[PDB]
Amino acid sequence: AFTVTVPKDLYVVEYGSNMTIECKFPVEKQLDLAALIVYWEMEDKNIIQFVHGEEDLKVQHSSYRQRARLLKDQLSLGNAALQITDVKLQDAGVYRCMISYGGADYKRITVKVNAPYAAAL
């Protein structure tokens, strides 16, 4: 079966830094945009909605608009990579990647936000 996997299911990310959490999905032949759908959510907030290459800034929850994007270059490698800039304490919690690509699956990723004392923040 089509399986989505996570290299890390727990991330510790610095307050004020950028973070990229990743979900892997199998891509054998050249990636087909017409078959690919990727959703990222956390606690009922819509973060990424990528439909056959289509996206719409408006559906993105306001707390993530202008901070969150899907790294397009990574998709052809079978990597659904969510990048969030300027990590806030409110970003800690559980994220869901849901991928449809000749089959469908999803994984949960847990993000912890820390503030190292000698870090930039």
Binding site: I37, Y39, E41, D44, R96, M98, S100, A104, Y106
Partner: peptide, 12 residues
């Protein structure tokens, strides 16, 4: 999952 449930509908 409700999110998972809604996602399968919109896709399938």
């Amino acid at each position: 999952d409700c999110q998972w449930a809604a996602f399968l509908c919109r896709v399938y």
